[PDB]
Amino acid sequence: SHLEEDCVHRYGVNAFVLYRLPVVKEGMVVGIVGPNGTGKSTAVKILAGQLIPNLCGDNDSWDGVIRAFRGNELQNYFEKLKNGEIRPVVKPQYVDLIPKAVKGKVIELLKKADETGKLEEVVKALELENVLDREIQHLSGGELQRVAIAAALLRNATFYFFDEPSSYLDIRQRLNAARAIRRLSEEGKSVLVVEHDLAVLDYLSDIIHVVYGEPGVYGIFSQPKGTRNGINEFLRGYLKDENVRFRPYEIKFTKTGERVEIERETLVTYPRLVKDYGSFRLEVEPGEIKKGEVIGIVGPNGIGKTTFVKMLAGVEEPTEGKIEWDLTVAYKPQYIKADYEGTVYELLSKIDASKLNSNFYKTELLKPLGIIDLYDREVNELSGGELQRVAIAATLLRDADIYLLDEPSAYLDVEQRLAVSRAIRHLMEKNEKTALVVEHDVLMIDYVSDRLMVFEGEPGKYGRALPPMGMREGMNRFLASIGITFRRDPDTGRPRANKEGSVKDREQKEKGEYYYI
């Protein structure tokens, strides 16, 4: 490792160094997974032709790159790139910035991008019908993301690169987008994709690269791996052929003998609830919450998931129905704006200083979420991802009967998501407390949950919360509405997506068994 010939790019005002690049292949989806700050987007910019790599020296031409990749399958790729025979289509990471770069209505922009005549089909697949007449200034993060994916899908090219397409998308939208993206590979096109949602990455990919190193300092692309081996090696934290142990422990999913079936005592019940906001209505079916369980909450956005959590938190009053509880609630809101003049250490030490000094909390919460490295940071200067982790930590440090975490995966990289899953679960097991977690990341839902609460309905119009039910029944119901099936992986115990049209997918769809444990 760290070979000079493999040194692809060094940022001058930074000194971050990237080693190696992923393979791209027509008729294949190549997936890229790794912590942020390790060069994933840098690699995409290079392969797209947007950044001429300097080879960790002073190279400033494609000729120098072509020579450096002598005897590499990428040599001819870069020749074609240099000569304009190829011009990759790039759905970039920074979809937030679309309003600053582009004006006008959405329909206008997708018309321009239409080089395939599939405007209606793409608009359908990404469910953009209600967004077509909107002006870009009035689009949500999630709508900006889907308009970007749409515009990339509509271009005619050979190479299509998608940098973090699941960001801002609900569970339905990310899985639908993955299906639509993968269809490019069935047409003989090449797809490169960077993803932090491991279920989506799995479903998307034929080949996987793991990116490893030290965020902000250096990153290295693994050798190409099969999808199963790659993700399994990522979870184990050890790349065998490269002989690199990049995490000192394994991230394990539940194998079928681990968690004892327990008939839990009821903590609280709630009756039928209704919450109206003008023309929107949420109806919640009567349900029960057990002592010491975690309920995962899943569904499309615009449906009342947050609204439900807010009623549980006592920050919102139901329109109809009555919550009669004598419980303490700790609440991690979906959207947080820092308004705190002090450091992370000050904030968390004032919640529970004894827990900050506890070995269990250091091991299971503070170290894995990277909170200790944030201790002397001002809370008001934290980024989205930093503030998310601190808020989760702050919530889990409180002493409560019930912990409510609304979309903790937002702004988190793959490594941080796995850490957050483990922390929620281990802390709730340790302290014998109860949690509800709203999440769109399927592997997070699978790791944290004992039972599942499904929301269904029409975004912005109506929503219905089903009573909490078993993992199998819950996921079957949800996944039926998307038409995607998952099996279990014997090695890691992780849910493993069946690709569209595969034999296991057919067998499962006929039996109506969309999800195994």
Partner: peptide
């Protein structure tokens, strides 16, 4: 905000 973005995004759309 970086002018790298306005280039990247306009290419996808424009």
């Amino acid at each position: 905000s970086e002018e790298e973005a306005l280039a990247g995004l306009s290419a996808l759309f424009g």
